Symmetry: C2
């Protein structure tokens, strides 16, 4: 029988009355601050259902969440949005640790940007306990904060050997977290990784799941991860802890996007068969295919030696890196043993087979692997070369034209699940970001509060075109949308800040400055001004900052006048500076070093400064810091080319005594710059074999770059040469 | 004519029609977001008035402010609360730089906790410009953020030689700012300090104005500060810059409150006569009476030599410090010259006249000063001692009994203005802090978010009484009120956090824990947990934290598990730990070191740990930091006595390698502690002549204290002796 309810108390009363076969129906509307405890006992033949009256019209908002407890329950047709769970989880298959749900199903529910307001206040969106549950045809998009999106817990035997089924879900875009802990799916935990979970993960679509290196983090035994599609996801399927898992029939469409992986093999008895991998650009732990070194006598949460891996009938097309014994170093000294790699197909048009061995690989026996003839084989025995031309079948996958070559690599009967065969038909799959300049153009004129008003009434994506003249700014310009501020004619729009901050970047703010001119002469006569900064409230969301063709002068009325000051726990997807000039600044240029608690957190993924000019800066061009020993991320990337830096970094308040100090940055490229009469470049290299190239620069009146290796010799690939010193 | 008005548009119409002698009347109610520009032109005999219908029933809230412009205006009967100014000032005697107000009056207006949301976003509450303006019978209380409460500006000749009158105002309690910039009243600035202001500050009441070392900051010429009362104010009347000022007929009741000053003499031609000073405990620049050294050939904003000071007929009763040549060092090398101190009366029951000379004082001539015979004199000529009994007249002031002695000190005819003769009768003068345990007692039972529920529904000042049993906490406990959490029976109420934070202290939160037991075994297995912390959003006001008779154990499920984590720009009025136990904690105990930009800002006024036990703490007991060279504040104070510390501070993630790392702390007292098998105490002493006492401790298996001096050797009184080192 159907039990329509319109209030939480009516819900309570319906739940008390509900019998096997009944449906409790949440009436269409917005249910705010509704902590749902669905605790009942259905029947194998007659489940008890909680569902929205009209899927897509029942919203659970504010501090709402859902707990299932009992057995034979079904929950469907709900949307969580405009809020965040006040507990540890949005959806949990338990009341608490002693009262679980089993034989229960959550299907056709949406969680859409239901994120905690602080990125590093951790929660999870779905937590599975108990046994024989199902989580299917759901739609999870936009988790911005630390904490896996979905996990299977194994904390007691009652939650082990679960045979849980996770299928046909849309795992929509998840942006970069900026530390470890951004997984989309975690099965188990290191503590319980030697127990058998038997979890089935099939026919899900992972669409730009970019939280961190692990898209899926398998951390238990004897799971089956099969028939999933990974589209442009900036990470990997990692067999992290736990043994005896099967990774099969999965499809990875990297499309050449940066840092796309990958199947990563660690531990024992793994089977990696019949997987299709295309256009994957990642390396090291984010490679298209990775077989790691382990630690002898590893602790339960470190790295266990690869032993009896089986890697067969996989197809790898334009996979840039296949890495064996990856992570090899003084700790991870146990190379792979008793393993086998057979009947795979590697087609690469980049001239190489993409293979790199980092240690002895004689414990992997290679047999009957096929390579295209133009790809220099890195390994002789076990690889044969042939004239291969690939053509795409109807199932969207590439196969050798020759039928005889189809005994290598992936089966022809694969049928990748599509983006529109997953999730719910009644909730759209949408683009996560607003593009710069995707809106309309608004003419703005001088000269008092005119910029404050134009920003406030513009719409996201708009472009403000400032006419020539003077823009006096008596009120902070707080940006909570995507906006471009463009001078109609470069250098003809002059912006005069009169407050301690000119521009503040809030949640949802992203900023492009193009051709503007800023004279900070009239800023308040106080130390510690900051021309541009994020909000100082911990942000919920990443931001983008682009600076082009612009000039910034006279940030020097008092000391410690910084150009850009990142808020604690803030994260820029990128900061890009092109063709811009900076002169007379007492503070730092970019302060990207706030996370000094060494938990692997950092402030910027890509810092790029090219073709620019900086003169008379007391502080550093950039201070960027990522501390600790985490190997779960790919950034910061710091790229600086073709700049001229004069009299930079020597102020008595610059404790770094550097023009540039880079701690824990993973990719460093400094090329064709001039460092004239300035403080040195200083590298503080950490774990994860960072890559540094400092070539073609002039250091006139500037000391040579300083390298401090905090992990001798752990160890980085550091190329510093081809530079003129004085 | 009366122009009663109910909306801003009606006000605008009424303003256009107002003629000399008219009253524009804001109707009773709440005017939110009202930026009042009161610009009109009365005559000397018929002013134009803006006033509330019923004083006490007209409120300006939100982003409201007031600007007077023109002449012969009066504004009265308004309350600013529940908001903050969107400009630089709440009330400004100008429209803008070029359009001032003269011959105008602001009287009987209240500003009640109208502070910016963020303490270090600077504003001011009252700015006076022009000439012949009056600010009387107003009521200003609770400004929390950086920026002087009220200042007279002298930016152009039009605002100089003003003869402004500031009288009969209630300058109510102002909490400690935690940096420079917390003045209650400023007359001028350094740039204009050589111009004459002629401002009259008389018959005002300063009730616990504790913003910083300067209650009044005189920064201009020929002003008169007379007949004011300073009640338990944590600061001083400073003649900061500027010459020829008269400080006269003022009364200081310190009542023995900590860091009560004081008249501070700097610069030339000052007259300090007939002031009464009682019970003042301050020292150095916050002394009861200070005559500073100056800087030879000083910059305009530094310190000008005391030249031709006249100090006579003042009474000083139990003033612990009278200091001559205060601040003498290598920079401040110019001792007072051409000065005279005559006919003062010093009565002190502590054994001494309280005088200290820090340099040559032959530039001060003394004659006919009287001191009680029991007080050992520091100076011979110009002083005599005698038998004195003080008796308190009806004016509240002490006078010698022997009529012959009444030629020393203050006149018997002084009439100190009373707290209830100042401000307005229709608005109450209140206590600023909710006292712990002033509400009701509330019984709480075990155990599933019962603590969460009891906190949400309690009222400020209440006491929660925890019955025996287990308190599981699956939601963060957010404290936005004053609250005590007491175990019914010490030790039978056990609190089990399940989130990475147990207690979050928000704006208006203040917390006492008494007899509680916290077992953090079940916290999330994640690094960087924090049992107690402020909100990480920048706070609006200070907080208090008291921990008594409590036990905290097993903060060790992962690394960097901190007991208490201060947010950026947060400030504790105090943190006090008594008779409590802390064991098995991987992080730091108290993280009070967030303000590393060296602007003089800090996180705690008083940190006190006594009679407590800390065992197996990987991090430091406390990291407290105050950076830079500011001398405008009194804290931090760090007091630790009679504790037992076993195995503290030797963790590999404690970069300080200290059990205690104290930088820029001004008062340090560690006595009768046991430090067993622990990392050392480390001092990093800064400017301001800090006082450090480390005596009577046992350092067994612990290095003896390390002293690093940043400014060798400009003061610092460091006594480390009588410790046992095994
Ligand atoms: Ca991970
Ligand atoms: Ca001051």
């Amino acid at each position: 029988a159907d039990l329509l309810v319109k209030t939480p108390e009516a819900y309570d009363q319906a739940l008390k009355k509900a019998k096997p076969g009944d449906d409790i129906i949440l009436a269409n509307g917005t249910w705010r601050d509704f902590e749902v405890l669905f605790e009942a006992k259905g029947n194998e033949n007659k489940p008890i259902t909680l569902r929205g009256q009209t899927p897509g019209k029942v919203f659970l908002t504010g501090q709402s969440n859902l707990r299932l407890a009992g057995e034979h329950l079904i929950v469907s047709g709900l949307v969580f949005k405009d809020g965040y769970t006040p507990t540890g989880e949005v959806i949990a298959f338990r009341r608490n640790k002693d009262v679980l749900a089993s034989h229960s199903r959550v299907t056709q529910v949406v969680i859409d940007n239901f994120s905690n307001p602080e990125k590093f206040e951790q929660d999870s969106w779905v937590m599975v306990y108990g046994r024989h549950n199902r989580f299917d045809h759901n739609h999870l998009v936009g988790k911005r904060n630390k904490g896996v999106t979905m996990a299977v817990r194994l904390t007691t035997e009652s939650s082990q050997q679960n045979h849980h089924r996770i299928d046909h879900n849309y795992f929509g875009p998840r942006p970069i977290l900026g530390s470890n802990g951004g997984e989309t799916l975690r099965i188990g935990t290191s503590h319980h990784s030697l127990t058998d979970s038997f979890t089935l993960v099939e026919n899900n679509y992972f669409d730009r799941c970019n939280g961190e290196v692990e898209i899926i983090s398998n951390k238990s035994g004897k799971n089956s991860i099969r028939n999933n599609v990974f589209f442009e996801s900036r990470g990997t399927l990692t067999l992290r802890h736990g043994n005896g898992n099967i990774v099969e029939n999965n499809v990875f469409f990297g499309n050449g996007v940066d840092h796309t992986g990958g199947i990563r093999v660690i531990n024992r008895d793994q089977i990696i068969r019949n997987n299709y991998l295309e256009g994957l650009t990642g390396y090291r732990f984010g490679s298209g295919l990775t077989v790691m070194n382990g630690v002898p006598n590893s602790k339960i949460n470190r790295y266990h030696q690869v032993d009896n891996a089986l890697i067969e009938n996989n197809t790898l097309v334009n996979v840039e890196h296949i890495q064996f014994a990856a992570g090899s170093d003084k700790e991870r000294s146990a190379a792979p043993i008793n393993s086998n790699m057979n009947n795979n197909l590697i087609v690469n048009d980049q001239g190489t087979d993409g293979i790199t061995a980092f240690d002895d690989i004689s414990g992997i026996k290679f047999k009957d692997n096929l390579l295209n003839q133009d790809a220099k084989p890195s390994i002789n025995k076990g690889f044969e070369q042939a004239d291969i031309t690939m053509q795409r079948h109807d199932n969207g996958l590439l196969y050798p034209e020759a039928k005889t070559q189809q005994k290598y690599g992936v089966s022809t009967q694969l049928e990748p699940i599509g983006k529109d065969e997953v999730g719910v038909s009644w909730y759209p799959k949408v683009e996560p970001d607003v593009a710069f300049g995707s809106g309309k153009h608004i003419a703005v004129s001088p000269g008092d509060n005119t910029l404050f008003d134009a920003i406030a009434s513009a719409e996201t994506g708009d472009v403000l075109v400032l006419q020539a003249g003077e823009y006096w700014v008596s009120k902070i310009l707080s940006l909570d949308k995507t906006l471009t501020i463009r001078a109609q004619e470069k250098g003809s729009a002059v912006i005069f800040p009169q407050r301690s901050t000119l521009i503040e970047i809030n949640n949802k703010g992203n900023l492009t400055l193009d051709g503007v001119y800023v004279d900070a002469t009239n800023a308040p006569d106080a130390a510690g001004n900051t021309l541009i900064r994020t909000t100082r409230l911990p942000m919920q969301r990443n931001y983008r900052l682009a600076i082009k063709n612009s000039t910034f002068e006279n940030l020097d009325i008092n000391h410690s006048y910084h150009f850009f000051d990142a808020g604690n726990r803030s994260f820029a997807d990128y900061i890009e500076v092109q063709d811009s000039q900076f002169k007379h600044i007492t503070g730092d240029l970019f302060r990207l070093n706030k996370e000094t608690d060494d938990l692997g957190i950092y402030n910027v993924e890509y810092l790029t400064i090219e073709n620019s000019n900086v003169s008379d800066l007391q502080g550093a061009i950039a201070k960027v810091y990522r501390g600790g020993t985490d190997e779960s991320t790919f950034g910061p990337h710091v790229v600086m080319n073709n700049n001229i830096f004069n009299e930079v970094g020597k102020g008595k308040r610059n404790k770094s005594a550097a023009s540039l100090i880079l701690h824990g940055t993973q990719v460093n490229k400094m090329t064709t710059n001039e460092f004239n009469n300035s403080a040195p470049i200083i590298f503080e290299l950490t774990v994860g074999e960072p890559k540094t190239w400092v070539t073609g620069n002039v250091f006139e009146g500037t000391p040579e770059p300083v390298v401090r290796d905090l992990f001798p010799l752990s160890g980085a690939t550091t190329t510093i040469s081809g530079n003129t010193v004085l």
